[PDB]
Every structure is written in C-alpha cells, then in structure tokens.
C-alpha cells in the first residue's frame, strides 16, 4: 500500500564527510535514486519528475564545514531546511556492526514530536522519506536495524542501531550519528512564503 | 552615497541581436541533426519528454543543458509539423 | 544496462553510414579506424579467454611435455 522513492542529490561545495553521508544513506535506503551533482533551486522538482521520485534529499553546503539538508516532497510538499552540526560517518572505526544493505529499518521516535503540529510534520516526513516502502526493489527481507530519532535541546539526534542476537537481544550502534536543527520550513517546494523560523 | 556606475558587457547580458538568432536557426535547419538529436526527436514523439530528458542528461553535461536541448528539439517539431 | 540504455549508446560518431554500395578499398580503411575505445573489465577478459580455448589446447601429451621442459630447466641450473 505504501509506495515511495527518494532522490539523493548534492551541491558543489560538499566536502569529504558530507559525501560519505550521501554514500551511507544511499546504502541504507533501498529506494535511493543516487544522483551525482547539481549546480545553481527550482530544478530539483523536475529531476524528481523524471525518475518518478516521491522524495528529494537536497544536501547543501554554503561554507564548506556546514551542511544543510533540504528534505522535501516534490510537487507541492513542505520542504524542510536543516543544519546538521555533529557528524560521525559509516566509515568511522569505533562503530561495530553490519546492517543489511537496504533492509527494512524500524523507525523509533519521541514524545515531544507530537507536542506541536510543527514536530508532527517532520515526524511524518521522517517516517516515509527516511524510512522504506514494504516492497522496494533493492530491499532485503529480514529486518536487521533501527532508526533512533529523539529530540533534546530543540534538535533531533539521529542514530542507526544494528540489532544483535544471542543463543534475548542486544543492539550495537553504527552508522551516521548526527543532530538535525530545524532551521526553516517553506510552504511549497523551494518557493512561497516561509512558515517556520527560529 | 552611490554614483550610478557605467554599464558593462553582461548587464545588457545577451542583447537580443536579430541577426545571430537568424544565423543560428539558419544553420540549424541546413546542417540536419546529430545522431543523438535524431534519436531524441523520435523519442519525444513516441516515449515523450520524460525519457528524452533522461537520455539528453546522460549524453550532455548537466540538467540545465538537457532543458535547453529538449526544448530546442521541441521547437524543431513545433515548426516542422505545423508551420 | 538494459536494452533501452544500449540503444542510446548505439548512436555513435559513426552511425548513419552506407556499407553495401561502397568499394572495398574504402571500407577496409574505414573499418580499421571506426572503433570507439569503450572501457573494459578483467571479468570479461576471463570469459573471452574461456570462450576461445579449444579442445586440444591442453592434452596429456603437452602437459607431460611441459614437465619435460621444466625438468630440463631444473637440470640446467645444477650444470653451473
């Protein structure tokens, strides 16, 4: 019943670490239509229109240390500008554990996401955008990891834990551990007046 | 205070130039089409602009290239068929 | 790559060329120099070496003869 597709795009100005985030998210998401590079705002709807994308992850970097994810629904959806502060990529050696490449995750959430309609919208968009469809073409059956989402100090801390089994269950943390500071929410996709500000 | 500076080259950016528009379009019709553009104009009529832009983007450099090119080919069709 | 992808790639620098009406002394100079250097793999070179290898390529005779060569080499390095 749920049928979705993500577009993973980049901007010129993305460094080493941020490139590894597009690598590892394209790994974890089986419905990730990975795209190389974009140069410029309005074009991204049309890219999504070509590949039949239900979602568009636009990773921007203005100053080369920064990262700004522009999560969106293409045709008329409310796009969300983030600023991602902390970063620990997939290829950091302290993390131990193999998730299946693009298996169905389990989305974990928080109480304070239902506190406002504001955090309710990002909660929903993280469910179907950062999540998975039940029958994605590159998706692996037996469920093997989670997506831990939790808010503290007005920012959502994202982690991906591989579940560990013994013969009841453990779970060792891996993958992109990062905060998401909700900067801005537009009314339409990359156009129209701004709904939310900080 | 400001002193209203002199105009430059790309401020009247691409000044229309009635003659060069004519020359580019004059060569366009005479030279025929490149083998990929020849496929592209068949692909608009059969499969549509969706796959046409997909092939054009793979063929050319960026997406802004594929916009201008498929539209250019759509004007080849718009003139050849009707007028 | 599917069928649809290769049909795109098929339109080369060298498409739309007649070949049946033309004299041989012209085509034998075109066909030598009409080869687009597409990237290869080691994975393909393996199978194409496995495709060309015929039956009498490695019989018992030539295996025994190969050892007969290497024994002579092992003798020649004790001749010094």
């Amino acid at each position: 019943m749920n049928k979705q597709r993500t577009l993973l795009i980049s901007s010129r100005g993305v460094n080493y670490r941020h490139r590894h985030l597009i690598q590892d998210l394209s790994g974890l998401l089986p419905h990730s239509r990975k795209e190389p590079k974009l140069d410029t705002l309005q074009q991204l709807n049309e890219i999504a229109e070509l590949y039949n994308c239900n979602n568009v992850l636009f990773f921007e970097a203005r100053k080369h240390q920064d990262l700004y994810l522009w999560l969106s629904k293409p045709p008329n959806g409310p796009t969300i500008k983030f600023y991602i502060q902390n970063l620990h990529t997939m290829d950091e050696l302290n993390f131990t554990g193999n998730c299946l490449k693009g298996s169905r995750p389990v989305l974990s959430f928080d109480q304070r996401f239902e506190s406002s309609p504001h955090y309710q919208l990002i909660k929903e968009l993280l469910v179907h955008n950062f999540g998975v469809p039940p029958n994605a073409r590159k998706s692996k059956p037996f469920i093997d990891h989670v997506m831990s989402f939790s808010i503290v100090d007005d920012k959502i801390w994202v982690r991906t834990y591989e579940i560990s089994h013994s013969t009841d269950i453990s779970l060792v943390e891996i993958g992109p551990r990062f905060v998401m500071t909700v900067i801005l929410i537009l009314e339409g996709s990359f156009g129209g007046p701004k709904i939310y500000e900080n | 205070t400001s002193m209203t500076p002199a105009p430059k080259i790309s401020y009247k950016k691409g000044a229309a130039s009635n003659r060069t528009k004519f020359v580019r379009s004059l060569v366009r019709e005479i030279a025929g089409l490149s083998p990929y553009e020849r496929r592209l104009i068949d692909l608009i009529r059969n499969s549509g602009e969706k796959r046409a832009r997909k092939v054009a983007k793979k063929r050319l450099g960026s997406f802004t290239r594929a916009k201008a090119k498929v539209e250019e080919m759509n004007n080849i069709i718009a003139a050849s068929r009707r007028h | 790559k599917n069928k649809h992808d290769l049909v795109d790639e098929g339109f080369n620098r060298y498409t739309f060329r007649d070949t049946e009406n033309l004299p041989d002394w012209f085509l034998e100079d075109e066909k030598e120099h009409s080869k687009i250097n597409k990237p290869i793999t080691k994975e393909a070179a393996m199978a194409i070496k496995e495709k060309i290898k015929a039956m009498n390529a490695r019989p018992i005779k030539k295996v025994a003869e190969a050892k007969a060569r290497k024994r002579m080499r092992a003798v020649a390095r004790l001749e010094k």
């Binding site: 049928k3 979705q4 597709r5 419905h31 999504a48 229109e49 590949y51 039949n52 994308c53 239900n54 293409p74 045709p75 008329n76 073409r137 590159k138 009314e187 339409g188 129209g192 007046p193 709904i195 | 796959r51 997909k54 | 599917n2 649809h4 992808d5």
Partner: peptide, 28 residues
Amino acid sequence: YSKYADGSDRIIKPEINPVYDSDDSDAE
C-alpha cells in the same frame, strides 16, 4: 488554482506516482 497562506497563488499539481518504468537503471 488555489492560493498560498500569504497573498500569493499556487499551482496545485497532481501527486507524483513512484513507478518503476521500462528503464530506471534497475529491474525486478
């Protein structure tokens, strides 16, 4: 067709249907 929240009009496009076509660099 409809409008934005503040003074401007928007164009309501139909929803985008995620369909694996004849060519999408990936098959069944």
